[PDB]
Design a protein around this motif. Structure first.
Motif, mmCIF file in Angstrom:
data_model
loop_
_atom_site.group_PDB
_atom_site.id
_atom_site.type_symbol
_atom_site.label_atom_id
_atom_site.label_comp_id
_atom_site.label_asym_id
_atom_site.label_seq_id
_atom_site.Cartn_x
_atom_site.Cartn_y
_atom_site.Cartn_z
ATOM 1 N N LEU A 264 0.839 -1.174 0.000
ATOM 2 C CA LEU A 264 0.000 0.000 0.000
ATOM 3 C C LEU A 264 0.888 1.243 0.000
ATOM 4 O O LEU A 264 1.798 1.345 0.830
ATOM 5 N N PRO A 265 0.635 2.204 -0.907
ATOM 6 C CA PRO A 265 1.447 3.434 -0.957
ATOM 7 C C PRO A 265 1.348 4.192 0.384
ATOM 8 O O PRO A 265 0.307 4.154 1.065
ATOM 9 N N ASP A 266 2.401 4.937 0.718
ATOM 10 C CA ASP A 266 2.446 5.618 2.003
ATOM 11 C C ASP A 266 1.641 6.907 2.165
ATOM 12 O O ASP A 266 1.718 7.543 3.214
ATOM 13 N N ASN A 267 0.859 7.313 1.166
ATOM 14 C CA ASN A 267 0.005 8.499 1.382
ATOM 15 C C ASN A 267 -1.370 8.045 1.888
ATOM 16 O O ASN A 267 -2.241 8.878 2.198
ATOM 17 N N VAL A 268 -1.550 6.728 1.973
ATOM 18 C CA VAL A 268 -2.800 6.134 2.419
ATOM 19 C C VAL A 268 -2.604 5.699 3.860
ATOM 20 O O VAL A 268 -1.627 5.061 4.193
ATOM 21 N N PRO A 269 -3.563 6.008 4.728
ATOM 22 C CA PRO A 269 -3.428 5.628 6.136
ATOM 23 C C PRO A 269 -3.459 4.138 6.467
ATOM 24 O O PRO A 269 -4.200 3.363 5.837
ATOM 25 N N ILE A 270 -2.691 3.761 7.487
ATOM 26 C CA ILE A 270 -2.706 2.389 7.970
ATOM 27 C C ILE A 270 -3.010 2.389 9.476
ATOM 28 O O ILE A 270 -2.888 3.428 10.156
ATOM 29 N N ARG A 271 -3.433 1.240 9.981
ATOM 30 C CA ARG A 271 -3.723 1.112 11.418
ATOM 31 C C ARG A 271 -2.403 1.124 12.186
ATOM 32 O O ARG A 271 -1.503 0.323 11.891
ATOM 33 N N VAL A 272 -2.270 2.061 13.129
ATOM 34 C CA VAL A 272 -1.053 2.187 13.944
ATOM 35 C C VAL A 272 -1.470 2.072 15.414
ATOM 36 O O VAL A 272 -2.644 2.130 15.731
ATOM 37 N N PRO A 273 -0.508 1.910 16.342
ATOM 38 C CA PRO A 273 -0.880 1.791 17.762
ATOM 39 C C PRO A 273 -1.726 2.972 18.230
ATOM 40 O O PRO A 273 -1.501 4.120 17.820
#
Length: 64
Positions: free
Chosen positions: A51-60
């Motif tokens: 997934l490209p890094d301008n898209v959000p991911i689940r983080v702590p």
């Protein structure tokens, strides 16, 4: 790029019932592919590959 749970606003996973739902969601956001992760770090949720890094991911933290 990174493999991770794609996040919905704000820092929430996208729960899933179908692998296809996750593949569509992931690829429309630029990922190579995706699937529904029923067992994982944050439990049920869509997991995307590359997934490209301008898209959000689940983080702590908390889903809010």
């Amino acid at each position: 790029v990174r493999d991770a749970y794609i996040a919905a606003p704000h820092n929430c996973v996208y729960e899933c019932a179908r692998n296809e739902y996750c593949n569509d969601l992931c690829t429309k956001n630029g990922a190579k592919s995706g699937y529904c992760q029923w067992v994982g770090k944050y439990g049920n949720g869509c997991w995307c590959i590359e997934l490209p890094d301008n898209v959000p991911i689940r983080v702590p933290g908390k889903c809010h």
